[PDB]
UniProtKB/TrEMBL annotation, chains A, B:
It is found in: Cell inner membrane. Mg(2+) 1 binds at residues 207, 266, 298, 328. Residues 172-423 form the EAL domain. The chain holds residues 978 to 1405 of 1415 of the full protein. This is cyclic-guanylate-specific phosphodiesterase. Residues 32-163 form the GGDEF domain. The gene is morA. 3',3'-c-di-GMP binds at residues 193, 210-211, 352, 388, 407. Mg(2+) 2 binds at residues 329, 385.
Amino acid sequence: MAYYDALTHLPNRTLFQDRLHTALQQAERNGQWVVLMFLDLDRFLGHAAGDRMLQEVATRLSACVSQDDTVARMGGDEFTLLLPSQGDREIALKRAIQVAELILGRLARPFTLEGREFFVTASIGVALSPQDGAELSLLMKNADTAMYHAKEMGKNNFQFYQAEMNARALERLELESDLRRALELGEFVLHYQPQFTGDGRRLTGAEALLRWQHPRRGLVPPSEFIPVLEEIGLVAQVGDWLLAEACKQLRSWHKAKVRVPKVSVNLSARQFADGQLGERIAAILYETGIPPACLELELTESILMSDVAEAMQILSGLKRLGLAIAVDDFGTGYSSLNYLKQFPIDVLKIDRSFVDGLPHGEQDAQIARAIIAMAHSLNLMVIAEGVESQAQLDFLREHGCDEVQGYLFGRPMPAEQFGMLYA
Amino acid sequence: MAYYDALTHLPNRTLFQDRLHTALQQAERNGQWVVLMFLDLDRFLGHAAGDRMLQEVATRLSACVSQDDTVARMGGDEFTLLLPSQGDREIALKRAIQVAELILGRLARPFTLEGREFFVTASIGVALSPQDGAELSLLMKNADTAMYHAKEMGKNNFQFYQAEMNARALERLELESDLRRALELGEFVLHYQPQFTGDGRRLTGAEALLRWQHPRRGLVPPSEFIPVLEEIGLVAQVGDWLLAEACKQLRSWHKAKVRVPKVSVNLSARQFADGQLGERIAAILYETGIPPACLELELTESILMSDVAEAMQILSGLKRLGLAIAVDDFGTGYSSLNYLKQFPIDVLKIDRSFVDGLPHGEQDAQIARAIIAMAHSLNLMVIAEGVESQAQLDFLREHGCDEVQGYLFGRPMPAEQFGMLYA
Ligand SMILES: Nc1nc2c(ncn2[C@@H]2O[C@@H]3COP(=O)(O)O[C@H]4[C@@H](O)[C@H](n5cnc6c(=O)[nH]c(N)nc65)O[C@@H]4COP(=O)(O)O[C@H]3[C@H]2O)c(=O)[nH]1
Ligand SMILES: Nc1nc2c(ncn2[C@@H]2O[C@@H]3COP(=O)(O)O[C@H]4[C@@H](O)[C@H](n5cnc6c(=O)[nH]c(N)nc65)O[C@@H]4COP(=O)(O)O[C@H]3[C@H]2O)c(=O)[nH]1
Ligand SMILES: [Mg+2]
Ligand SMILES: [Mg+2]
Ligand SMILES: [Mg+2]
Ligand SMILES: [Mg+2]
């Protein structure tokens, strides 16, 4: 079409502007964000090889974005990208960071024409609608301004139009950098929180809890760095380290006459979706010599109930491995009672938020009784988390809560102190 | 832009084709459907008034479709519409029917130019991707073929490319036609199914159940015609008829010494979303002279839990009206236990599907015990629906189910027989 660049087959300037306008009008109607990127090359060649290079650039750019994103060619050495329908500021910001890093990484790679090797460098400017403009020409002014800022900083850079996003981008990249290194140097450590029978007479297991100690940031809370791990391929690899470390710990504790009956590991949504999950778990159980009965997986009702049919199969695979399954944070999500019984699950965990109102919050008291009753109706065992007070414990015990966990019974703890404190 | 028609400001042929292509490539990737319509005018005027008419046509067409749909001008008197991202065949079919009827209705209306009145007529052809083509040129061949079929049938017609859809369209329109008439002539009737205490010693209420008797189709099941009602503005108006009829019935039964303590009415999602719901209910309670305690509303957990924050407010409004609220079909949806307690609800109804497996289906038996236990933990009263057998009843009674309903206790029934059968 007259609307496409004859060489790269990408939309031309006018078509791209129409789609940008459309994306802006729609975003504004749905309270969504749009990312606009401008990209310039210094190249860095031959005439025919030149046009062949632009073609390779184009291919590489298309490969960095999804189905719904547009890549286009403004002219000469300038390309633009459009990432529409981003749910909010932060999704937009992360997706922009991710796409821009991906692009610079792909364009770093050498261009192999005439048998030989060439390099190009790129400068990228990024502007996010609506904040940097909800109108196409303002959004473009600002992406272009960011681009030139990116140039004024040297080779292979991306800048946002907002300084605040540039700062946040730089830090995010450093965090990612540190987390890769954390795994390489082993800066992660496992702490264990003990689990008891409702009376407190007895230790039923330990919940393993990832911590991260960085020399400068100090100790980073799991809630900060875990989501970052899963936003890369890092989490499966960290999960492997963790599972193996807990299995080894179990080994040492048994050797040292510390009778810990089992250990619980939390799983993210990403780990749960992984096709090799059960395979990697079996692999680790085999290396460490520990049986599946010693292990329990903890998944949130949001992870299980989003796609119930898929979850049924994944869970069934894991049970055939002989391991137990607990539904973490229970009561904070949306659950089919139907599938709660069909899923081969073992345990419900009463979220801390409900335990916190005990014993004199009517709402929290009734919700907690209800969970216990559900659990026992489905032959599930339930443990209350976040038990911090004698009164909470009295209530839960009085109403048949099977197991209990919380600061009242001692904080999360490194393995050796754990053994001594609960031997 | 050179891409837009200078007169109507609609996209021109080439731009429309690009968006159609895009919509097809995307639909195919997401397993979605796309609707394409071709529209021709016979007009049916003056030169300046002519161009002003096309402009009015354009405005009218834009007003018939949503934000995301494209309207365009192929040339002369021909326009096209694109309705992308339709979830499946039937959504597509209904949406096409709806949009086409809307367009013919708007174009029926007179054009007021030079002070005077004019009429145009239109022929519409409709083709649905992927079935009538997943490639733009084939989809266009076929919409155009449908259009000419529409012409060969006379004025103001739409045809699908598939004969099967034309048949289904014609029938759907006749159904809609009949339902409007049904309401005008009162062909709807209420049947009532009685509700008892778990023992059976005692009648706690009656669930009202809409039926429709058509002279030719015979008796149409609620599941067939109710969704059609709500796909128009008909359901609020039928709901009003129904509520009023049940309140009147309650009047007569009390007059005639038939002690029916209350009546339950089912609500659709659409009725529930209506801003005037509580207002219209109060209005009807006032006209019929019956107090809110005599009334109970039945809503599905899917209606309540889709938007919990909105539902909380809507429900709170209804409770302030003094009426009771039951969660129908419970166990078949996704529910926050948290919001189950916060929502000011009164009753859970155990779906028939779980009662059906009783008493010897382990899964169904445990689910049903669990619901009863939940209900009583939250101080809710629960009734089992679809109780058909002595064994089912024994089980439910043994486990403290408060109330019961089903064919074992007698089918749904017209009011007067109801009174005599349960006085
Ligand atoms: N207020 C209160 N809090 C208590 C009490 N007892 C324990 N806690 C804290 O509550 C959290 C319980 O873990 P969770 O619900 O699985 O929730 C976890 C889990 O979802 C995730 N997480 C932790 N470790 C891992 C891991 O190794 N892998 C994965 N995939 N996620 C993890 O991060 C979340 C937070 O972990 P932590 O920061 O260790 O926070 C832990 C624990 O330190 C108490 O009595 N009162
Ligand atoms: N297998 C079995 N079935 C039994 C038994 N006892 C009753 N039923 C049937 O099960 C349905 C119970 O109604 P529902 O769950 O509210 O489900 C209702 C309700 O959601 C909707 N509906 C019915 N009347 C109205 C109404 O007036 N307004 C609205 N908005 N929806 C209605 O249509 C659905 C079906 O209504 P019906 O066709 O009357 O079907 C009724 C009733 O005839 C039993 O022992 N065994
Ligand atoms: Mg946990
Ligand atoms: Mg938690
Ligand atoms: Mg009902
Ligand atoms: Mg039902």
